[PDB]
Amino acid sequence: ARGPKKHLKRLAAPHHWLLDKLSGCYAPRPSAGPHKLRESLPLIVFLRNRLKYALNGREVKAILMQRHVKVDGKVRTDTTYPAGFMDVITLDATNENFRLVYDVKGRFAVHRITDEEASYKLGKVKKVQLGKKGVPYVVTHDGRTIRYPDPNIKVNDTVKIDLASGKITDFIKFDAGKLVYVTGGRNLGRIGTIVHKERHDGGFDLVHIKDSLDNTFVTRLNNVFVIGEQGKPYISLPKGKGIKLSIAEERDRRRAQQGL
Amino acid sequence: SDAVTIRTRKVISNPLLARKQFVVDVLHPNRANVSKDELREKLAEVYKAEKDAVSVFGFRTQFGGGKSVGFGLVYNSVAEAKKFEPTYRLVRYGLAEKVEKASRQQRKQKKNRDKKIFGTGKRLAKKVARRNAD
Amino acid sequence: MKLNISYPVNGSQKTFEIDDEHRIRVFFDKRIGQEVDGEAVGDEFKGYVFKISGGNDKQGFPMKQGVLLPTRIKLLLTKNVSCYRPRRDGERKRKSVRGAIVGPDLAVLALVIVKKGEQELEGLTDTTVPKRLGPKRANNIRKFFGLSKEDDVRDFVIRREVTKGEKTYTKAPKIQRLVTPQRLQRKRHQRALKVRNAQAQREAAAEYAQLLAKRLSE
RNA sequence: AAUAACUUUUCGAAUCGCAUGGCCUUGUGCUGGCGAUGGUUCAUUCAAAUUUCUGCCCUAUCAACUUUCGAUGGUAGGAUAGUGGCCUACCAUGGUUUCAACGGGUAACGGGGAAUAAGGGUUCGAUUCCGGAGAGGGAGCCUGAGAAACGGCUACCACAUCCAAGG
RNA sequence: AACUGCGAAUGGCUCAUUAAAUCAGUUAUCGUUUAUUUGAUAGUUCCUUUACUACAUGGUAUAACUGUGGUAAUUCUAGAGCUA
């Protein structure tokens, strides 16, 4: 209708934000940015609903206008900024650094990291073009453009990028035997190995993923994010290491650890 | 009225808002209710916050009586308890003054009236007064 | 009708009321912008030439230049056109407007004095109304005093005195387009940022050519 | 990316705030920080417009519809942000249909869903979410990135207000 | 106050039209536009290249305001001065 929309309603927000049904008619409506709004996290959701550092939306802005929150090494001041996958939100007042990375239930995890590993991130390359004046570039999964990459970088590789400079450090190719991170679908937040990749000319190549517990599942190619070699990731990992216990074990782990 | 016990649960320090925030759990086994003002007195003693760096707002007496639970804030350096508190919660404690203004009906009716003129308005008042005078 | 005679050289304004049909009839069949000699208007008006500038009819509708056939006509009026102020941008409106030729239906009419004759009018010629503001932009103050390109116009600004009841304080415009060391720092920094950026891309391109030359060893 | 050119010659910072620092050849000298606004192209995001496949209730008391004032296709053009009979010129005679076209009706917005609950089904869904349409009816447009916008503009009709009767 | 910039195309209401239409799931854009957000991105601007043209920085033209008015009437406005 006549132009882009500015509102977003509760019961239309992404379910991995875990906003409650009642107590509000609307939802934060992420701004335009590096990450698609279905798979991003607004800063208000991360500092009020996850960290509980705020009780209202009014004092999220009170926090943000003091230039406390840095996303990817730069101070960001809008309330509904689209933070997403491997974003490196750091609160210097608390000296807490975070990396946004997925739960095994598909949610975003409160994953706290150190001062080192808060100075880089990984971005899956979307396309490798040759821009004008003959200068090649890559773009990453968060819309970052890096000029003059290494000529052995092709699509679906991951790339380790510095946050102070924006340059490209060493990278990881895409072949069998590499650790992955699944970023969309039924198996969101699961960690495994490339072992078989099915080419399909005409659309949607599929990858067979094998985790450490000898299970196997299949996702599309565009839900797969390589994060290093087997047993040697390039980032820290959340609780559980993306393992997808069935509901029988999760009943067992809960009741055993409830007490002792 | 034998005793009241202040139990502060779920204490989270908030450096980037310059405050400490927690769940107040008061156990008043014979009192009727516990009346937030002397909670602000008693919470000041256990945190050294001179009754102006503290705020309690959300209390609910449990069914059957004898227990009430609410939220509580304790600030650093009272000058920062006016920087970050909402104005409505300062005027409960007397730190801020209740600002006086007309109702929304008059505040909107005035804007629509003032939207009709263009400019200062005192160029037209000069030329309409002389027609009213003569 | 009624007259609004303005004398622009002195900047004075005064309204006259004439009821004589024979003096009014000279104004008839005349378009706006046509000069009218005033010797037929009055004994005091010898030597004067008046240029018709505008006015309103008996219902308040103003005349408009170029709108010949002097009867009320509705036009679609746009921005940068008189008798209309657009309420929102892009809006244009159809409004009534009155023709340029003077007729007997005008409630008022506005005139300017082009050339002064021999005679004197007490309400319009002797009294002076001064210019409201002085120049604010730097060259507008330079050529107002006939200053050269080096005369440091900062101290030649028109400066009005204001007293509350007992304290004469003076206020002046902030001179725009004024050459300041801050403006010279800004020009230097943007100019330097262009050279420094250009050298860094020439270094990154040269380094990349070294990498490709290394890969041609295989 | 390269060559030869072309252009009512697009862009290539005459903008703003806090700071005020370093060098000697002592000049309002030469340099110099943080960040606001802008700007060409590319990418990204928020979109939008088209678009493929399959799927809709009652009716034969509707069996033949569509071409000539575009219906189906071809070539070229115009126009559009762009594809395309979208429009035009020329040319061909196509296209749909008893596996129900075309016409008619609907007290028909579509869907997620609701009611009833052996299974299978029957009935409902204006209406808390998604998509569409509309702002008394129908056209036409300005501005803009985005509207055929109506708490924008250009005249009507179920209309209808004000008066000094001129608007 | 007013000029400039942005927004007013979101929201909210309703279900009249609409029966391969809308819509649902599923595709394509190697068939396009895209303010804003985010990341990149601009040593070439001049004249057959010596008497050259401001770059320590070019020009008017208006609002607001002053002043004189019209109309029974409205977010009606005219003429004259000034200045970003």
Curated annotation (Swiss-Prot), chain A:
GO terms for cellular component: 90S preribosome; cytoplasm; cytosol; cytosolic small ribosomal subunit. Coiled coil: none annotated. It is found in: Cytoplasm. Transmembrane segments: none annotated. Keywords: Cytoplasm, Isopeptide bond, Phosphoprotein, Ribonucleoprotein, Ribosomal protein, RNA-binding, rRNA-binding, Ubl conjugation. CDD domains: KOW_RPS4, S4. Its main location: cytoplasm. One of its GO terms (biological process) is translation. PANTHER family: 30S/40S RIBOSOMAL PROTEIN S4 (PTHR11581), SMALL RIBOSOMAL SUBUNIT PROTEIN ES4 (PTHR11581:SF0). This is Small ribosomal subunit protein eS4A.
Curated annotation (Swiss-Prot), chain B:
Keywords: Acetylation, Cytoplasm, Isopeptide bond, Phosphoprotein, Ribonucleoprotein, Ribosomal protein, Ubl conjugation. Coiled coil: none annotated. It holds the Pfam family Ribosomal_S24e. GO terms for cellular component: cytosol; cytosolic small ribosomal subunit; mitochondrion. There is a cross-link at K20 (Glycyl lysine isopeptide (Lys-Gly) (interchain with G-Cter in ubiquitin)). The modification N-acetylserine is found at S1. Residues 104-114, 123-134 have a biased composition (Basic residues). GO terms for molecular function: structural constituent of ribosome. Residues 101-134 are annotated as: Disordered. N-terminally acetylated by acetyltransferase NatA. Also partially acetylated by NatC. The modification Phosphoserine is found at S13, S55. It is found in: Cytoplasm. InterPro entries: eRP_eS24_sf, Ribosomal_eS24, Ribosomal_eS24_CS, Ribosomal_uL23/eL15/eS24_sf. GO terms for biological process: cytoplasmic translation; maturation of SSU-rRNA from tricistronic rRNA transcript (SSU-rRNA, 5.8S rRNA, LSU-rRNA). Component of the ribosome, a large ribonucleoprotein complex responsible for the synthesis of proteins in the cell. The small ribosomal subunit (SSU) binds messenger RNAs (mRNAs) and translates the encoded message by selecting cognate aminoacyl-transfer RNA (tRNA) molecules. The large subunit (LSU) contains the ribosomal catalytic site termed the peptidyl transferase center (PTC), which catalyzes the formation of peptide bonds, thereby polymerizing the amino acids delivered by tRNAs into a polypeptide chain. Belongs to the eukaryotic ribosomal protein eS24 family. Component of the small ribosomal subunit (SSU). Mature yeast ribosomes consist of a small (40S) and a large (60S) subunit. The 40S small subunit contains 1 molecule of ribosomal RNA (18S rRNA) and 33 different proteins (encoded by 57 genes). The large 60S subunit contains 3 rRNA molecules (25S, 5.8S and 5S rRNA) and 46 different proteins (encoded by 81 genes). There are 2 genes for eS24 in yeast. This is Small ribosomal subunit protein eS24A. The gene is RPS24A.
Curated annotation (Swiss-Prot), chain C:
There is a cross-link at K116, K131, K149, K214 (Glycyl lysine isopeptide (Lys-Gly) (interchain with G-Cter in ubiquitin)). It is found in: Cytoplasm; Nucleus, Nucleolus. Its main location: cytoplasm. Signal peptide: none annotated. The modification Phosphothreonine is found at T163. It comes from the Eukaryota. One of its GO terms (cellular component) is nucleolus. One of its GO terms (biological process) is maturation of SSU-rRNA from tricistronic rRNA transcript (SSU-rRNA, 5.8S rRNA, LSU-rRNA). Present with 66000 molecules/cell in log phase SD medium. Component of the small ribosomal subunit (SSU). Mature yeast ribosomes consist of a small (40S) and a large (60S) subunit. The 40S small subunit contains 1 molecule of ribosomal RNA (18S rRNA) and 33 different proteins (encoded by 57 genes). The large 60S subunit contains 3 rRNA molecules (25S, 5.8S and 5S rRNA) and 46 different proteins (encoded by 81 genes). Interacts with snoRNA U3. uS11 interacts with MPP10. Component of the ribosomal small subunit (SSU) processome composed of at least 40 protein subunits and snoRNA U3. Belongs to the eukaryotic ribosomal protein eS6 family. This is Small ribosomal subunit protein eS6A. It comes from Saccharomyces cerevisiae (strain ATCC 204508 / S288c). The gene is RPS6A.
